[PDB]
Design a protein around this ligand. Structure first.
Ligand SMILES: *[C@@H]1O[C@H](CO)[C@@H](O)[C@H](O)[C@H]1NC(C)=O
Ligand SMILES: [Sr+2]
Ligand SMILES: [Sr+2]
Ligand SMILES: [Sr+2]
Ligand SMILES: [Sr+2]
Ligand SMILES: [Sr+2]
Ligand SMILES: [Sr+2]
Ligand SMILES: [Sr+2]
Ligand SMILES: [Sr+2]
Length: 145
């Protein structure tokens, strides 16, 4: 957190610098090493600033199974929509070409055909659908607590 005074002369540490204190991306970055690791992190972090306290609710929100807020932190496995349709490969370009991928929103675990919300859309974690008919649509992901 930089509570000043030769604290930056010591090894980076995630518990202590970011889980235990609020942190700058540069603090994570120093504590995490790899940057791909720092993109994923930040993304989870930044979607969990609304649930930083208790520090038990933060562990729930970073875990990724439940959705908090509009669930930009959802990192779970639900893959079929609200209508029941099944999601498209974010990787895939058919039947609809995604405009958000990995290149665009990389903190965001766009793995498989999983529900995600790179975008923080108001109606929650969603995905691209199979139906040539319907492009994208909300998913029914569990809510945190
Ligand atoms: C979206 O990501 C794919 C990789 O799967 C890439 O080939 C495509 O060019 C990207 N589209 C945009 C963001 O340019
Ligand atoms: Sr620090
Ligand atoms: Sr500190
Ligand atoms: Sr540091
Ligand atoms: Sr601790
Ligand atoms: Sr401290
Ligand atoms: Sr630095
Ligand atoms: Sr520093
Ligand atoms: Sr370092």
């Amino acid at each position: 957190a930089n509570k000043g005074f030769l604290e930056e002369v010591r090894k980076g540490n995630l518990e202590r610098e970011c889980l235990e204190e609020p942190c700058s991306r540069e603090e994570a970055f120093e504590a995490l090493e790899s940057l791909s690791a720092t993109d994923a992190f930040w993304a989870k972090y930044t979607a969990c600033e609304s649930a930083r306290n208790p520090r038990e609710k933060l562990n729930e929100c970073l875990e990724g199974n439940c959705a908090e807020g509009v669930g930009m932190n959802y990192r779970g496995n639900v893959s079929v929509t609200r209508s029941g349709i099944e999601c498209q490969l974010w990787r895939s370009r058919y039947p609809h070409k995604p405009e958000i991928n990995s290149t665009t929103h990389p903190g965001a675990d766009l793995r498989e055909n999983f529900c995600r919300n790179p975008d923080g859309s108001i109606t929650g974690p969603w995905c691209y659908t199979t139906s040539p008919t319907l492009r994208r649509e909300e998913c029914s992901v569990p809510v945190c607590g």
